[PDB]
Design an enzyme around this catalytic site. Structure first.
Site, PDB file in Angstrom:
ATOM      1  N   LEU A  23     -13.449  83.782  -6.849  1.00 28.71           N
ATOM      2  CA  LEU A  23     -14.140  84.844  -7.554  1.00 28.71           C
ATOM      3  C   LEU A  23     -14.068  84.536  -9.058  1.00 28.71           C
ATOM      4  CD1 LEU A  23     -12.409  88.002  -5.798  1.00 28.71           C
ATOM      5  CD2 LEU A  23     -14.501  86.846  -5.099  1.00 28.71           C
ATOM      6  N   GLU A  30     -12.080  96.892  -8.989  1.00 25.77           N
ATOM      7  CA  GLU A  30     -13.133  96.509  -8.125  1.00 25.77           C
ATOM      8  C   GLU A  30     -12.446  96.152  -6.780  1.00 25.77           C
ATOM      9  OE1 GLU A  30     -14.687  93.995  -6.346  1.00 25.77           O
ATOM     10  OE2 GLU A  30     -16.293  95.570  -6.131  1.00 25.77           O
TER      11      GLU A  30
END
Ligand code: NDP
Ligand code: 53V
Length: 225
Positions: A23, A30
């Site tokens: 990521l 999140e």
């Protein structure tokens, strides 16, 4: 008969989602959203499934996999079946498509899956546009003095906006009923696009929790015997 929901965090305007197997940000807020949505159920006696490609699985830290309190499915073409338990909390599949049909059988599942979350990565997502009923997309934007991170993997926004419309007005009602969100719903223009959903800020970024839903479809054929 159980919903199939794609769930992803994407950087606007290209919808970048990864770089070199990982990521491109680390945003605890999140992550907490993704955790809660995929874990939590309206019905306490059900779990959700999380389906992911082999490369995504290999990127999750070892102590954190399989993701707790959800049925984990890992898809690799070098695996054996449609759907085989390999360890506690872990199924292997050689087929995204067949594993979903396998997961949907009330005989196998005893109506105790609530939803099926498709949790990535790029390749898996490419293949899910004509499979998913909805998409939960966290739309991420670097704040003005934030450097745009490099990225190498993208959500197919074209094919997205072909098949789905922005249904973020119904995002709150769509989520499991015990989740609590910090923001209210919010339409904001950002580099020439309408961004609608539930605001947060963390680190160098602003992000919106959004919901996309399948567009209405004409009645061309129903199968008769
Ligand atoms: N921002 C976000 O929300 C998310 C981002 N990501 C990012 O995505 C990137 C990874 O995506 P990507 O590299 O495309 O890899 P994936 O996670 O999509 O895994 C791809 C692998 O999945 C297997 N596979 C793909 N299609 C099928 C199929 N139909 N049936 C059976 N197996 C299949 C194959 O495994 P094999 O090679 O073993 O045969 C393939 O090589 C990383 O950067 C990651 O950080 C991941 C999750 C979420
Ligand atoms: C690439 O390596 C990964 C690592 C993790 C991970 C990390 C870094 C720390 C602790 C626990 C985990 C599970 C998770 C993921 C995936 C499965 C994802 C995802 C996801 C996210 C984060 N958000 C929204 N909205 N959708 C999603 N599909 C991938």
């Amino acid at each position: 008969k159980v919903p199939v929901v794609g769930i992803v965090a994407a950087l606007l305007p290209e919808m970048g989602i990864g770089f070199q197997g990982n990521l491109p940000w680390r945003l605890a807020k999140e992550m907490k959203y993704f955790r809660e949505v995929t874990t939590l159920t309206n019905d306490n006696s059900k779990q959700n499934v999380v389906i992911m490609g082999r490369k995504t699985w290999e990127s999750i830290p070892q102590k954190f996999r399989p993701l707790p309190k959800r049925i984990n499915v890992v898809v690799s073409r070098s695996f054996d079946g449609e759907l085989r338990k390999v360890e506690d909390g872990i199924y292997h599949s050689n087929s995204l498509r067949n594993c979903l049909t396998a997961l949907q059988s009330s005989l196998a599942n005893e109506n105790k899956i609530e939803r099926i979350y498709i949790i990535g990565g790029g390749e898996i997502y490419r293949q899910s546009m004509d499979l998913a009923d909805h998409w939960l997309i966290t739309k991420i934007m670097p704040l003005p003095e934030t450097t745009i991170p490099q990225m190498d993997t993208f959500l197919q926004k074209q094919e997205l906006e072909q098949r789905f419309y922005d249904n973020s007005d119904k995002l709150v009602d769509f989520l499991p009923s015990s989740i609590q969100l910090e923001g209210r719903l919010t339409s904001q223009e950002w580099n020439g696009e309408l961004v609608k959903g539930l605001p947060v800020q963390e680190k160098g970024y602003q992000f919106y929790f959004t919901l996309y839903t399948k567009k209405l479809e004409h009645h061309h054929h129903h199968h008769h015997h």
